[PDB]
Structures are given as structure tokens and as C-alpha cells.
Write a protein that binds this ligand. Structure first.
Ligand SMILES: Cc1cc2c(-c3ccc[nH]c3=O)c(C(=O)NS(=O)(=O)C3CC3)n(Cc3cc(F)ccc3F)c2cc1F
Length: 563
């Protein structure tokens, strides 16, 4: 069946759309080639519609059926809880899209009578009606990139009331079921340090390792109605409250398998028969589907001792080599099996024999040295997108600060320490905003974090070595330096100079600012300050940070104030 059908109505914006990076003094201090930075808009939506619309042909076999039964036997151990309305309301981001029914995210979070009444009505409707397709809005996503232009990605999501109900029925399922089913292969249970440890230990565990990343083209569009019903068959193995069982059944038939598309103007846009990108099950469902197809494809390909690491549609496989020619042929057999399963490749996978050459979750393993000269493995990535987005976020107030998420997740990297920390601490200190909480995203969930709490966050995630790495690889240094020339970012010497300045100012303030000066900027001086465990680090409640993926799932993970 076609992933989408269209009526001809356009994918419309709801307000004015900015596509060019503004010429602003603060962003220009970071990145001077402003014309290279752009944001996607609804103006390119028709190009994306063409790419995501195609017929799916899916052929299932015994390997697929065998793996599915194995997955369901593991799902059968799970007991999932129905969330109360209050619990589901607290998981709603403060800036989540308002309902079309007269209330918004602040009303949901405040448990306003109108919001609660409407959520109760939507819940009862899911329990009573098993078939009426649920309306969804389709919008073009506004995302920033560096040239060499991508068309806008499309986001499809139901109304706020339905999103609260999805949490009630499925938040516990999507949070706990993936690790129960996939075990160590489930990527979202790992912090970046745990992920690098898992990749390095897996790589070194093979007698002669071979690894590859597998890029499915337009994954959400490749997801069939059969895949979404198979995903529900796994959720149904949980012990569930009867209302949760009916809600999951109704949500599957009325929303997850497909439904009508409406634009921002209220016009009928078309019909979807594939994965919606903006529902609570997007991450979990994609992860399960990708794991199932890949596990079965490994068996069809006769790949030896496969270890998968899956995050949604992002897949990396590490296995035992059977020799270069045999590996090349088995990888072609894997691709053929994935294609039969309706997961054809974007670019053909390539066998890799060096762990540092593999890109998974847009990241690669690299090596640096700690204060003792000991080798420390860590995850890095090409810094082009992070820098382009940091420049955008400097010129415009954006709802999500990718720069803050990048400092947290890529804290050990040369580029996050020398450029992102220096730039934003310099600006925030000048604005007396170091203690102002900002929103960022970790594995798709929204968190409100104060920049002054970064040292203890980084220590907990990455260890104290994140503040002592030096002797970065020549390849990594070259990639960063080349990116700076390309984007017109000042060279690393300028960053060191700016860091010494903000470091002095932070130290002069005492308190949490001085802890930022000491730990975050010790790299900038020859006269190193002594770095001991931060007392606040052991007290941090990082429950919920690295449990599951929630991208597109409308999840907020910071504390709700009492009432
Ligand atoms: C080192 C490291 C950092 C991240 C971050 C991450 C970086 C910066 C800020 N905040 C973050 O969370 C994410 C991530 O953005 N997750 S997500 O669910 O929104 C997914 C995009 C939909 N991931 C998983 C992931 C990354 C892809 F680039 C692609 C697919 C994926 F699953 C990571 C894996 C890692 F090894």
C-alpha cells in the first residue's frame, strides 16, 4: 500500500517562517559564514512529500517469524502500569502544542477543569470506539543545517488530549518493554560513556570483528500496517490493566496504523498508512521493528555472532568476520533480506574493520588521554550541525537549546569544551543568566537545566576525565579545525583566549560559577586546579535520563511544582 496519499491541499505554516540565519553580533562571534546556515520551512514540504510517498512491498519469512516469537517470549515478562491523569499531565512539556478544543499545555500541567474534562472524554472514547480514525496534523519541521539543501522533515501528531491518553496507556510500556525484549541491544538504556563502553567491549569481544551501520531510507515510510500490528502484538504480551489493553487496541487501529492528515488551516491533506513521527510509540515501535527486521536479516545472511545496537531506526551491527569476500557477500545478503522486510537501504552498508570508522547515532568512537596519560574512549561527531544550530540559538530564542544538550552529551569532545562551553558561558555570564534554567533534549525527552549545574551533570555522565582529556587524535583535531574554516568559526587559539577570560570571571564570582570555572575550563590554563568529586554529583537524580527513547513522543522529564 502507499505510505501516503495526498488530496492536493498544501502543508501550511501556522506563522511566519525564518529560513536564513540572522546577521547578529553574538552569533557572528561564533560563526561568520551566516549564508551557509539555513532552517528548513514548509516551502520545501512538496520535495519531502515526493521522497516519503511510495508503495511498500513486504515479504515475511521463517527467520522473521522465529525472531518475533523470541521477542514476544521476552515481552511476556513485563507488567505495565496505567498512569493516572495527573501523572500523564506532569509528563506534558509546558510548550506542547495546544489542543484544538480550547485548552493548552499550561492548562494540562495545572490540571485545569477544562483540560481534565476533555482528557477524560478522549480516554472514554478510546475505550468505547475501536475504529473511528483519529485526526492528525501534518506540519513541516523547522530544523537548522549547514549547506552541502535538505527539504523539511514532516511531523504528524494527534491532538493534545489524545497525547495525554497515549501516556496513560503506554508510557510505562514504551519505557520498560524495549530493554526487556532487546536486552543489551537497546541503545537508549546507555549514557554516552556506557554506550562507548558497550561498543568497545563488544568490538574487543570478537576474535576478528567486523561492524557496519545500516541506514534505512525514510524509515517511517517503510513501516507497514503489518509492522504496526506486529508491534501491538508485542505490547499485548505485557500484563496490562483492561482499560490499557483496550486503549492500546483502539490507538493501534485508530491512530498508529494510519489515519487522515489535516494541515494547520484545517484542510484535509491526505491519508497516512505508515509510522506517524509524532506519537508516543514512534521511538519504541521503530526500535522494535528495526531490531526484529535486522535480527531476522542477520540469520538470513548467515552473519556470525551478531551483536546489534539499536536506537529507533539507527542501527549498528558488530559481528565475527568470515573474511573480507565472505563479509562483503553476507552484507549484500543482509541488505537483500532487509529490503524484502520493507527496510531498503539509503546508501549501501559497508563492512568496517576499525571501530573508529563506524558512525552510529551520528557519532564515532575516538580516543584521548586523561591527566595520567591513560587512554580514554569517548563518543564524538562531526561538529558542523551542532555549530550551525548553536549559531541559530544565539541569534534567536528557540524552544529547545541544542547547544545545551550537545554540551551534556558531547562534554568530553574538543569542540564542546573549547567552543560551545566558552561561547555560551561568555554570553550567559554577561547577561547574568548562568542560573536561568533552559530547555534541552536528551534521547527525545525535554529537560529544564541550569547551565551552572553542568559540572556535576558532566561528572555523573562522563566521569572527572571529561575535564582532563588532552592529546586528542590528529583525525579528530583535523575534522574540528576544517569545520571551523568551512563555517568561518574563529580558530581554536581564539577559543582558548576567550575561555581564559570567562574562566577568570567565573572564578571571581565564587559559588557554582567558580565550580564551572574550575572544572569546565581547567583545559584553558597551564596552572591546573585540583579536580575532586563534586559533592552535588552523587546527589543528582538522573532517573529517567537514560532509560528509553522518546523522540516525537511529547515527553517532559523535569520535576512538577506542587499545588
Ligand atoms: C553521544 C550520543 C548523543 C546522542 C543524542 C543527543 C545528542 C545531543 C543532545 N541530545 C541527545 O539526545 C541522541 C539523540 O538525539 N537521541 S533522539 O532520541 O533525540 C534521536 C534523534 C532522534 N542520541 C541517539 C541518536 C542520535 C542520532 F544522531 C540519531 C539517532 C539516535 F537515536 C545519541 C547517541 C549518542 F551516542
Amino acid at each position: 500500500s502507499m505510505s501516503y496519499t495526498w488530496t492536493g491541499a498544501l502543508i501550511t505554516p501556522c506563522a511566519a517562517e525564518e529560513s536564513k540565519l540572522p546577521i547578529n553580533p553574538l552569533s557572528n562571534s561564533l560563526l561568520r559564514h551566516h549564508n551557509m546556515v539555513y532552517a528548513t520551512t514548509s516551502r520545501s514540504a512538496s520535495l519531502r512529500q515526493k521522497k516519503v510517498t511510495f508503495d511498500r512491498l513486504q515479504v515475511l519469512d521463517d527467520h522473521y517469524r522465529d525472531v518475533l516469537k523470541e521477542m514476544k517470549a521476552k515481552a511476556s515478562t513485563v507488567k505495565a502500569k496505567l498512569l493516572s491523569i495527573e501523572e500523564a499531565c506532569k509528563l506534558t512539556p509546558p510548550h506542547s502544542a495546544k489542543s484544538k478544543f480550547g485548552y493548552g499545555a499550561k492548562d494540562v500541567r495545572n490540571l485545569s477543569s477544562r483540560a481534565v474534562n476533555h482528557i477524560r472524554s478522549v480516554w472514554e472514547d478510546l475505550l468505547e470506539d475501536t475504529e473511528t480514525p483519529i485526526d492528525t496534523t501534518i506540519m513541516a519541521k523547522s530544523e537548522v543545517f549547514c549547506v552541502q539543501r535538505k527539504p523539511a522533515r514532516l511531523i504528524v501528531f494527534p491532538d493534545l488530549g489524545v497525547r495525554v491518553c497515549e501516556k496513560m496507556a503506554l508510557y510505562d510500556v514504551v519505557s520498560t518493554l524495549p530493554q526487556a525484549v532487546m536486552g543489551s541491544s537497546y541503545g537508549f538504556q546507555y549514557s554516552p560513556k556506557q554506550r562507548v563502553e558497550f561498543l568497545v567491549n563488544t568490538w574487543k569481544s570478537k576474535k576478528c570483528p567486523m561492524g557496519f551501520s545500516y541506514d534505512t531510507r525514510c524509515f517511517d515510510s517503510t513501516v507497514t500496517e503489518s509492522d504496526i500490528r506486529v508491534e501491538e502484538s508485542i505490547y499485548q504480551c505485557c500484563d496490562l490493566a483492561p482499560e490499557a489493553r483496550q486503549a492500546i487496541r483502539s490507538l493501534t487501529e485508530r491512530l498508529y496504523i494510519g489515519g487522515p492528515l489535516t494541515n494547520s488551516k484545517g484542510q484535509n491533506c491526505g491519508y497516512r498508512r505508515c509510522r506517524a513521527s509524532g506519537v508516543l510509540t514512534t521511538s519504541c515501535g521503530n526500535t522494535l521493528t528495526c531490531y526484529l527486521k535486522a535480527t531476522a536479516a542477520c540469520r538470513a545472511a548467515k552473519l556470525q555472532d551478531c551483536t546489534m545496537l539499536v536506537n529507533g531506526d539507527d542501527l549498528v551491527v558488530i559481528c565475527e568476520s568470515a573474511g573480507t569476500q565472505e563479509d562483503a557477500a553476507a552484507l549484500r545478503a543482509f541488505t537483500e533480506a532487509m529490503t524484502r522486510y520493507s527496510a531498503p537501504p539509503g546508501d549501501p552498508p559497508q563492512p568496517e574493520y576499525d571501530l573508529e570508522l563506524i558512525t552510529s547515532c551520528s557519532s564515532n568512537v575516538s580516543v584521548a588521554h586523561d591527566a595520567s596519560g591513560k587512554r580514554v574512549y569517548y563518543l564524538t561527531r562531526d561538529p558542523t550541525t551542532p555549530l550551525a544550530r548553536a549559531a541559530w540559538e544565539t541569534a534567536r530564542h528557540t524552544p529547545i537549546n541544542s547547544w545545551l544538550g550537545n554540551i551534556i552529551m558531547y562534554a568530553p569532545t574538543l569542540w564542546a569544551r573549547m567552543i560551545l562551553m566558552t561561547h555560551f558561558f561568555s554570553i550567559l555570564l554577561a547577561q547574568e543568566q548562568l542560573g536561568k534554567a533552559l530547555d534541552c533534549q536528551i534521547y527525545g525527552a525535554c529537560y529544564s537545566i541550569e547551565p551552572l549545574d553542568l559540572p556535576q551533570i558532566i561528572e555523573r555522565l562522563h566521569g572527572l576525565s571529561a575535564f582532563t582529556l588532552h592529546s586528542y587524535s590528529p583525525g579528530e583535531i583535523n575534522r574540528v579545525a576544517s569545520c571551523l574554516r568551512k563555517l568561518g568559526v574563529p580558530p581554536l587559539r581564539t577559543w582558548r583566549h576567550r575561555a581564559r577570560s570567562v574562566r577568570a570571571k567565573l572564578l571571581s564570582q565564587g559559588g557554582r560559577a567558580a565550580i564551572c570555572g574550575r572544572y569546565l575550563f581547567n583545559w584553558a590554563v597551564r596552572t591546573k586546579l585540583k579536580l575532586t568529586p563534586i559533592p552535588a554529583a552523587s546527589q543528582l537524580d538522573l532517573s529517567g535520563w537514560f532509560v528509553a527513547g522518546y523522540s516525537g513522543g511529547d515527553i517532559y522529564h523535569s520535576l512538577s511544582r506542587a499545588r
